[PDB]
Design a protein around this ligand. Structure first.
Ligand SMILES: [Ca+2]
Ligand SMILES: [Ca+2]
Ligand SMILES: [Ca+2]
Ligand SMILES: [Ca+2]
Lengths: 86, 91
């Protein structure tokens, strides 16, 4: 099977698709799916994020009202880079 | 921590675990990078070829070290290949 690091990378990727398949396109997060992912799975790392509707807008870099995997990955990188600082 | 948060913490911590071994404690020398790949990415980087060449390719500022940003670009490469398998095209 996978190492601790490999399984962790796989979990990060799987979590996107778990949330993205709930409604509309199965390969992107709507605002509702993004809000679910944050509230369910990032309640600690995003505790101080403020308005989720604004954060969605900020991450939606091509202004199509959905987060594709690349845009979610940008969020993961932001969270990683904050953790690194500790 | 949630499953997702634990996983992001693991990805970050694994870097420092290998980086603190010798030299600058916040970067991977080529020896520390080879240890990380062999011990912790043996499957995802099974087909990577020369580790010394991979190190060079990841060492974007040619300082002979991988700082966290440079390791994170590797994790992104690996994540994109996983993404392909978690969203298969029937075509
Ligand atoms: Ca969706
Ligand atoms: Ca978008
Ligand atoms: Ca080092
Ligand atoms: Ca470097």
């Amino acid at each position: 099977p996978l190492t601790e690091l490999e399984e962790s990378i796989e979990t990060v990727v799987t979590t996107f698709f778990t949330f993205a398949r709930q409604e509309g396109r199965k390969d992107s997060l709507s605002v509702n799916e993004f809000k679910e992912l944050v509230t369910q799975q990032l309640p600690h790392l995003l505790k101080d994020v403020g308005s989720l509707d604004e954060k969605m807008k900020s991450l939606d870099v091509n202004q199509d009202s959905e987060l594709k995997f690349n845009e979610y990955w940008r969020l993961i990188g932001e969270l990683a880079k904050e953790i690194r600082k500790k």
